[PDB]
Each structure stands twice: as structure tokens, then as C-alpha cells.
Write an enzyme that holds these catalytic residues in place. Structure first.
Site, PDB file in Angstrom:
ATOM      1  N   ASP A 177     -16.110 -14.925 -52.082  1.00  0.00           N
ATOM      2  CA  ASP A 177     -16.516 -13.565 -52.443  1.00  0.00           C
ATOM      3  C   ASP A 177     -17.992 -13.345 -52.125  1.00  0.00           C
ATOM      4  O   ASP A 177     -18.845 -13.722 -52.919  1.00  0.00           O
ATOM      5  CB  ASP A 177     -16.275 -13.354 -53.943  1.00  0.00           C
ATOM      6  CG  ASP A 177     -16.636 -11.954 -54.408  1.00  0.00           C
ATOM      7  OD1 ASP A 177     -16.862 -11.073 -53.552  1.00  0.00           O
ATOM      8  OD2 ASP A 177     -16.680 -11.741 -55.641  1.00  0.00           O
TER       9      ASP A 177
ATOM     10  N   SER B 252     -25.265   0.895 -42.095  1.00  0.00           N
ATOM     11  CA  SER B 252     -24.501   1.273 -40.924  1.00  0.00           C
ATOM     12  C   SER B 252     -25.136   2.518 -40.296  1.00  0.00           C
ATOM     13  O   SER B 252     -25.707   3.369 -40.992  1.00  0.00           O
ATOM     14  CB  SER B 252     -23.048   1.552 -41.339  1.00  0.00           C
ATOM     15  OG  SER B 252     -22.296   2.097 -40.269  1.00  0.00           O
TER      16      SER B 252
HETATM   17  C1  LIG Z   1     -12.806 -10.899 -58.810  1.00  0.00           C
HETATM   18  N1  LIG Z   1     -13.233  -9.829 -57.900  1.00  0.00           N
HETATM   19  C2  LIG Z   1     -14.340  -9.853 -57.017  1.00  0.00           C
HETATM   20  N2  LIG Z   1     -14.384  -8.714 -56.364  1.00  0.00           N
HETATM   21  C3  LIG Z   1     -13.317  -7.948 -56.802  1.00  0.00           C
HETATM   22  C4  LIG Z   1     -13.041  -6.591 -56.238  1.00  0.00           C
HETATM   23  C5  LIG Z   1     -11.540  -6.329 -56.071  1.00  0.00           C
HETATM   24  N3  LIG Z   1     -10.895  -7.404 -55.268  1.00  0.00           N
HETATM   25  C6  LIG Z   1     -11.287  -4.972 -55.407  1.00  0.00           C
HETATM   26  O1  LIG Z   1     -10.902  -4.984 -54.215  1.00  0.00           O
HETATM   27  O2  LIG Z   1     -11.500  -3.950 -56.095  1.00  0.00           O
HETATM   28  C7  LIG Z   1     -12.612  -8.629 -57.750  1.00  0.00           C
END
Ligand SMILES: Cn1cnc(C[C@H](N)C(=O)O)c1
Length: 330
Positions: free
Chosen positions: A35, A199
Site C-alpha cells: 500500500d 498530473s
Molecule cells: C486498508 N486500506 C488501504 N487503503 C484502502 C483504500 C481502499 N482499498 C479503497 O479502495 O477505498 C484500504
């Protein structure tokens, strides 16, 4: 040193990607969600509330000869989707794709929110944003990448996410066979702890390019592409029947539609996201309404270049003293 690890979509919609990570001695392999939008390495563990574990593989520090409690340290994190987790902290040896870090903070979950429990495919998170976002208290901890930097051939990692297919995270080198053309680098601000960049604009399908500055973050942990309401409205206006639904929670479109591509600017370069990548399929099983992969950032406070955008490119996260982000076609 270098490392290279394959990352695999968790489901048929590329909702997230998991990468195997070796923790402890002997190795315990957990599948973690890498992440670039957070800075904690946390795992399901032998300490996680039993009712909150459902199918995940857990880290057991008592079975690791190299695990040590980081006495008094705790952590607690919330993410942009409202999910959360918290617990205490061990140090242990962590290896990714052959690259080993000793003394890595491994944050052991005592509690996780329901979204984590319900996703049996994700055994934890490995954060790759800047360490200033790390939640460990009272002594903030470094990310895997920050700890690895000293040993890396070059202070970089790269994300090469697949569309309905596995991809690769590399550490310490740029694989010149993994992209086409040249890599365009653009400035990063670390002021908010993210891989934040600007961007240079966008186009919808075969339309003209609109030169306009869009500040946002490169976030492998977010599924979709979240952009200003003006931009998102211009995109969905080109899809017959598309509309924003408050009941569903965003833009939906008739599943019979053919979606246009979406282009974003990186300096004078252009990354094209194929229309197919923006189709997230029926809102519920059997529905003829489909969920859009480009959504408004208006309720978030930041624009997010999530997996929908990043998977269309080979992306270099350059963690040199002056950090930058590079994008190439592939
Ligand atoms: C644990 N986590 C880290 N980032 C997220 C964002 C989530 N996956 C989304 O797309 O909204 C969750």
C-alpha cells in the site's frame, strides 16, 4: 541488494493485490497488500481477536526465533474506506522477493474492522508511503522500504500491476524490459506523507487533451481512480445512461455500454487507461447496472491515482533524497 516479488489480484475485479512476504525464523509466509498510501506493516496474528479472524494466515511471534516484543509500542490506523486495525508491535526479520530487512517493525493486530475479517485473502498490509505517516506510538517506526534503502542498489521500488493478471513489485532496480518507450519522471511532495504529484491534465476517449493541474497521490492500496467532480462528470457524460447514484455510492452505467478510455498527463507524456479497466461490473450479482472505475474525489479531500490508473503504467517510486515518480507505458 534487490528484491523481486509477484503480486496477484485477490479477485476477478482486481479489487486489490497480494504479495507473499516472509516473516520470522523459520519463515512464516503471509500474503500482504502492498500500500503506497500508508506506512504501517501490520498482520493478522496469534494476538488477533479470534472472532475477527476468518481464513487469514496469521503470524505467530512465539514461533519465531528472531521475534522480539517492541515493549510499550502500540499502533492504531484508520483508512480512507473507513476500515481500521490496531495492536502491539514486534521486531522481526522480513523478506520480500529475496530482499531481507532485519529489525523490521511488524505490527501485530489485536483488533481489525469487519472489512478486514471478511477478506480472507489479505493477511495484512505493507505500507510504502513515507515513514512520517507510521502510526506506532510512542516511537514511530520505519517502513520496509525505508529500512531496506541502505542495502538497495538504487533507492527505488517499482509497481507493475496487472489487468486481470499478476504483476510485479521490484526493489532496488528498474527492469528495463518491463516497459516500452521512456520513463517520464515528475516531482513529488512529501509534505502530507504521500507519493503526491501533479498530473498535467486529461482526455476522455479520443477527445482533446485538457491541460490542467491535478494534484493527487499514487496509491496502490486504493482500487479506483478518484478525480475532481468536473473531470469525472466530463468522463461519464460520454457514456449513455451513466449517472451518479447516491444509493449505490457513485457513478454507475448500463452494463451494455462500451466505455471510453481515459488519458492522464505526466509532464508531456500521456498514460492511457483502456475503457475495459474502468468497468467494475454489476453492482450486485445479476444486475444490469455496472459500477464505474472513475469516481469523484469531492468527498475525500484528495485525488487518488489508485490501481485503475497505476495498472496502465510501469511506475517508479524513486526514494532518493529528492523523491520523484516515474511513469512509462507497458
Ligand atoms: C486498508 N486500506 C488501504 N487503503 C484502502 C483504500 C481502499 N482499498 C479503497 O479502495 O477505498 C484500504
Amino acid at each position: 541488494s534487490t528484491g523481486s516479488a509477484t503480486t496477484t489480484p485477490i479477485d476477478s475485479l482486481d479489487d486489490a493485490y497480494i504479495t507473499p512476504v516472509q516473516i520470522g525464523t523459520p519463515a512464516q509466509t503471509l500474503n500482504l497488500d502492498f500500500d503506497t498510501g500508508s506506512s504501517d506493516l501490520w498482520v493478522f496474528s496469534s494476538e488477533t481477536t479470534a472472532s475477527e479472524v476468518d481464513g487469514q494466515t496469521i503470524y505467530t511471534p512465539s514461533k519465531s526465533t528472531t521475534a522480539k516484543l517492541l515493549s510499550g509500542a502500540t499502533w492504531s490506523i484508520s483508512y480512507g474506506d473507513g476500515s481500521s486495525s490496531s495492536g502491539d508491535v514486534y521486531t522481526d526479520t522480513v523478506s520480500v522477493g529475496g530482499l531481507t530487512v532485519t529489525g523490521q517493525a511488524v505490527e501485530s493486530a489485536k483488533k481489525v474492522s469487519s472489512s478486514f475479517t471478511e477478506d480472507s485473502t489479505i493477511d495484512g498490509l505493507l505500507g510504502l508511503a513515507f515513514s512520517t505517516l507510521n502510526t506506532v506510538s510512542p516511537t514511530q517506526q520505519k517502513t520496509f522500504f525505508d529500512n531496506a534503502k541502505a542495502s538497495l542498489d538504487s533507492p527505488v521500488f517499482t509497481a507493475d500491476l496487472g489487468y486481470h493478471a499478476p504483476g510485479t513489485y521490484n526493489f532496488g532496480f528498474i527492469d528495463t524490459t518491463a516497459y516500452t518507450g521512456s520513463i517520464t519522471y515528475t516531482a513529488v511532495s512529501t509534505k502530507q506523507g504521500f507519493w503526491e504529484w501533479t498530473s498535467t491534465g486529461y482526455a476522455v476517449g479520443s477527445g482533446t487533451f485538457k491541460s490542467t493541474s491535478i494534484d493527487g497521490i499514487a496509491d496502490t492500496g486504493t482500487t479506483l481512480l478518484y478525480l475532481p467532480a468536473t473531470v469525472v462528470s466530463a468522463y461519464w457524460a460520454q457514456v449513455s445512461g451513466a449517472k451518479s447514484s447516491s444509493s449505490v455510492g457513485g457513478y454507475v452505467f448500463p452494463c451494455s455500454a462500451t466505455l471510453p478510455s481515459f488519458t492522464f498527463g505526466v509532464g508531456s507524456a500521456r498514460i492511457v487507461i483502456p475503457g475495459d479497466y474502468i468497468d467494475f461490473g454489476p453492482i450486485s450479482t445479476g444486475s444490469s447496472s455496472c459500477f464505474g472505475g472513475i469516481q469523484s474525489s469531492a468527498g475525500i479531500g484528495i485525488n487518488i491515482f489508485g490501481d485503475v490508473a497505476l495498472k496502465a503504467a510501469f511506475v517508479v517510486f524513486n526514494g532518493a533524497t529528492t523523491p520523484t515518480l516515474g511513469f512509462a507505458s507497458k
